[PDB]
Amino acid sequence: MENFQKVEKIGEGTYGVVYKARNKLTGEVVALKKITAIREISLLKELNHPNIVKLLDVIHTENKLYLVFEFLHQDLKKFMDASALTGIPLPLIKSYLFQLLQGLAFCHSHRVLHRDLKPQNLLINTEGAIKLADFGLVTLWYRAPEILLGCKYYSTAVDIWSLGCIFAEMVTRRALFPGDSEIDQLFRIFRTLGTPDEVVWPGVTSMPDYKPSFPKWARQDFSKVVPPLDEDGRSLLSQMLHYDPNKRISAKAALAHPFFQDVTKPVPHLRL
Numbered sequence: 012m013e014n015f016q017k018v019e020k021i022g023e024g025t026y027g028v029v030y031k032a033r034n035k036l037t038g039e040v041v042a043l044k045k046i047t048a049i050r051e052i053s054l055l056k057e058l059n060h061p062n063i064v065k066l067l068d069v070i071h072t073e074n075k076l077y078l079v080f081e082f083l084h085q086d087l088k089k090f091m092d093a094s095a096l097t098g099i100p101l102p103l104i105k106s107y108l109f110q111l112l113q114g115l116a117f118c119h120s121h122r123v124l125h126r127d128l129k130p131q132n133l134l135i136n137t138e139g140a141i142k143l144a145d146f147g148l149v150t151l152w153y154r155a156p157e158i159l160l161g162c163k164y165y166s167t168a169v170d171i172w173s174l175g176c177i178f179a180e181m182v183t184r185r186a187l188f189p190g191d192s193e194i195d196q197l198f199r200i201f202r203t204l205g206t207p208d209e210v211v212w213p214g215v216t217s218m219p220d221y222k223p224s225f226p227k228w229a230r231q232d233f234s235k236v237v238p239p240l241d242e243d244g245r246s247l248l249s250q251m252l253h254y255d256p257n258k259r260i261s262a263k264a265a266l267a268h269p270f271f272q273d274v275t276k277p278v279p280h281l282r283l
């Protein structure tokens with residue numbers, strides 16, 4: 012793109028490639044993603060929040076689509092890997108979870124879903140801020156069960172599920188449900204939370220990919236799942252991981268949870 016100088020590749024994946032880049036007249040350092048679509052993308056331009064990576068610009072040209080974003084230096088996956096020996100301190104975990112809940116409460120109120128939350132698209136700065144990136148418009152590990160079961164009209168609850176999975180992972184320093192196929196993801200969830208049935212998830216047995224032949228596992232003790240998380244954190248997590256999307260806690264209610272009574276905003280130690 013005429014107006015941009017590529018610095019380095021910082022991101023790849025499914026649809027686009029992401030570079031760190033430098034604008035030629037503003038001097039701005041940016042993340043440049045190279046790829047109905049155009050109308051929904053432009054709506055993202057107005058979805059502005061301190062916990063949403065900020066879309067600076069959209070350049071549609073020569074059958075390429077460039078999305079220009081504010082640049083952040085670190086992402087949560089790399090930060091987790093870097094923190095594996097010690098673990099992220101709880102008050103930092105708690106601050107990041109609260110911030111992301113604020114971000115989602117905002118999206119959700121505007122009827123925008125993320126759909127694909129994972130540590131690698133959660134960006135962090137030296138300020139202690141954490142931001143939602145790559146708004147959907149370790150692949151499966153964060154997928155809500157109603158998606159895996161073939162629901163086509165899934166809700167904002169799917170983002171809560173993903174964020175609960177991420178919360179558990181910060182705490183334990185291991186992925187909660189590291190499935191390597193859709194059936195492995197589903198069965199790993201069932202093994203931990205119990206095979207769902209009509210008791211805990213009314214309508215589950217009428218989902219498109221639900222099979223009566225699914226094995227029937229009993230649900231484990233959360234105390235076994237996320238030690239040494241405290242009872243406030245465990246209780247919040249269990250509400251974020253409810254099978255029934257209609258029972259799962261909303262972002263806005265989760266912000267009121269007692270877990271956040273003593274929330275603060277620590278700064279992480281980053282290696283730039």
Ligand SMILES: O=C(N[C@H]1CCCNC1)c1n[nH]cc1NC(=O)c1c(F)cccc1F
Pocket residue numbers: 021022024029041042044064080081082083084085086089131132133134144145
């Ligand atoms: O990738 C980014 N920063 C990287 C810096 C090096 C460590 N790693 C983080 C980034 N900064 N600002 C936006 C941005 N990336 C995205 O918006 C993004 C994403 F995170 C995932 C998929 C597509 C995409 F465009």
